[PDB]
Amino acid sequence: GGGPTSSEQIMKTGALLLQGFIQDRALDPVPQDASTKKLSESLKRIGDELDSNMELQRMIAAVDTDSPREVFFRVAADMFSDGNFNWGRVVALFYFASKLVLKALSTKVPELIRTIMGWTLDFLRERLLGWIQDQGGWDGLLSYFGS
Amino acid sequence: GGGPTSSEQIMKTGALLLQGFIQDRALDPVPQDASTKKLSESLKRIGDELDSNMELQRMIAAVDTDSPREVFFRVAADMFSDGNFNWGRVVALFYFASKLVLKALSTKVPELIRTIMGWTLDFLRERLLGWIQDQGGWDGLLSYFGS
C-alpha cells in the first residue's frame, strides 16, 4: 500500500525501469504502466545518446572481463565516492549496468563454444573415432564432398 | 608426426572444423590451412541448408533449456543408436552442436540480465534509496525529465 516514496515501490519500479533499459540496449518488452512507460522513453533517449559515445564504448570493451561483478561495484562506488547524488548519475549507472550485460555475454559466447565443443569432441573421440579412422581421417570427408 | 588417420590429427582437425562451423552459424574466423578451409566451405553449405529447415529450427527452440549437456548426449546417442555411421550423420551432429551454442546462450542472456540486475538493485537499495526517497521516489525522475 506504499506510495512512490516507499522502499517497496522504489525497488519494484527500479527493477522494471532497469529491466526495460537493459532490453532496450539489446526480447519482449517489459510490461509497464503508463507513468513508468513514460520514464522508460526518456531513458531510451539517454541510452541512445550514450551509445554514440565512442570513447565510452571503447573503454567498456577494454575492461578486463574475468569478474564483471567486481567491475560493477568498483565503478558504482567510484561514481558516488564524492557523496553527491543526482538523477543524471543514477541514470548513467543504469546505462552502465545495461552495457555490462552485453559485455558479460561477450565472455559467455566463447566459453559456451568451448564447453559445447568439449562435449562434441568427447563424443567424437569415444564413439566416432574408430569409424573416422576407417575413412583415413577427415581427408575422407574431403573425398565425400568431391574434393 | 601422425597423418590424417592418427587420433591426434582427427581430434585437432575436428576441433578446427567444429569451431569454424560454430562461428559460421553466428567472431574472427578460425585459422585453417588450405585443405581444412576447403572442408569448412562444404560444411558452410550444409549449415546454410539446415538453417532453412524451419521444422528443425522450431524443434531446437522447443527443447527444454535447463541442461543443454543432457540434450546433447541424448541426441548424439539417439542418432547413432542403430550402430550405423556415415559422414552425413557426423556433419549433422556438428550442425546440431553449433545450434546448441546459440540456444544455450538464449538461456544465458536472461540469466545475465537477472544477475546484473541483482547487483544494480542491491547497490541502489543500500546506497541510493535514501536520496531517491528524498525525491519522492521515481516520480521525482518524471519531474526531472519534465513529465
Binding site: I46, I60, V71, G88, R89, V91 | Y144
Partner: peptide
C-alpha cells in the same frame, strides 16, 4: 584502469545531464 576512466566519464555525464535538466 578503464574502470576508473568509465566511473569518471559516467560521473561527468551524469552531472552534465543534471546541469541541463536542472
Amino acid at each position: 584502469r578503464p574502470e576508473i576512466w568509465i566511473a569518471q566519464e559516467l560521473r561527468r555525464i551524469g552531472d552534465e545531464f543534471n546541469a541541463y535538466y536542472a
